[PDB]
Amino acid sequence: MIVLFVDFDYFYAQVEEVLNPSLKGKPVVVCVFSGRFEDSGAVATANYEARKFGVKAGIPIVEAKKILPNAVYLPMRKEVYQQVSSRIMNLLREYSEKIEIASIDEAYLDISDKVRDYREAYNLGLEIKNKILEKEKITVTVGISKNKVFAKIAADMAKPNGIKVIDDEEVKRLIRELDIADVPGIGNITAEKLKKLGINKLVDTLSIEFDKLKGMIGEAKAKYLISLARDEYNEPIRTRVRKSIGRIVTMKRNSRNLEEIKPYLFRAIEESYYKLDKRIPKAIHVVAVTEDLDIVSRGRTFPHGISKETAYSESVKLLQKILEEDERKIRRIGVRFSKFIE
DNA sequence: GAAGGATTCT
DNA sequence: TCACGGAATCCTTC
Ligand SMILES: [Ca+2]
Ligand SMILES: [Ca+2]
Ligand SMILES: [Mg+2]
Ligand SMILES: [Mg+2]
Ligand code: NA
Ligand code: NA
- Is residue A7 a known part of a binding site? yes
Q: How far separated are the first and last CA of chain A, in Å rounded?
A: 30
Instruction: Check residue A201 and report its DSSP letter.
Output: B
3-state secondary structure of A59: coil
Query: Are A91 and A135 in contact, with CB atoms under 8 Å apart?
Result: yes
Query: Are A113 and A163 in contact, with CB atoms under 8 Å apart?
Result: no
Query: Are A25 and A13 in contact, with CB atoms under 8 Å apart?
Result: no
Query: How many Å does it take to go from CA A299 to C1' C13?
Result: 15
Q: What is the resolution of this structure in A?
A: 3.6
Give catalytic status of residue A106 as yes or no.
yes
Query: Are A32 and A75 in contact, with CB atoms under 8 Å apart?
Result: yes
Q: Which nucleotides of C are covered by protein (CB under 7 A)?
A: 1-12
Query: Are A147 and A108 in contact, with CB atoms under 8 Å apart?
Result: no
CB proximity A274–strand C (7 Å threshold): no
Query: How many Å does it take to go from CA A268 to C1' C7?
Result: 13
Q: Which residue is nearest to nucleotide B2 (CA to C1')?
A: A301
Q: Which of A237, A7, A241 is nearest to A109 (CA)?
A: A237
Instruction: Check residue A328 and report its DSSP letter.
Output: P
Q: Was domain A2-10+78-166 assigned CATH 3.30.70.270?
A: yes
Residues 273-302 of A with CB under 7 A from strand B: 283, 285, 294-301
Pairing status of strand A28-33 against strand A72-75:
parallel
Interval between CA A198 and ligand 4 midpoint (Å): 31
Instruction: Check residue A182 and report its DSSP letter.
Output: G
Neighbours of A76 (CB within 10 A): 17
Query: Are A90 and A101 in contact, with CB atoms under 8 Å apart?
Result: no
* CATH number for the domain formed by residue range(s) A11-77: 3.40.1170.60
User: What is A244-336's CATH number, 3.30.1490.100, 3.40.50.720, 3.40.605.10, 1.10.10.60?
Assistant: 3.30.1490.100
Instruction: Classify domain A167-233 by CATH architecture.
Output: Orthogonal Bundle (1.10)
Q: Which of A45, A82, A78, A49 is nearest to A61 (CA)?
A: A45
Measured torsion, CA atoms of residues A107, A112, A116, A121, in degrees rounded to the nearest 10:
0
Neighbours of A141 (CB within 10 A): 22
For chain A, the domains span 2-10+78-166, 11-77, 167-233, 244-336
Measured at the CA of A210, the angle between CA A205 and CA A215, to 5 degrees, comes to 110
Instruction: Check residue A277 and report its DSSP letter.
Output: T
Q: ω before A160 within 30° of 0 (cis)?
A: yes
Distances (CA, A) of A10 to A45, A59, A63, A80, A192: 7, 15, 20, 15, 28
Distance, CA of A227 to CA of A207 (rounded, Å): 14
Q: Which of A335, A315, A341 is nearest to A271 (CA)?
A: A335
Q: Up-side HSE of residue A36: CA atoms within 13 Å toward CB?
A: 17
Q: Which residue is nearest to nucleotide B1 (CA to C1')?
A: A301
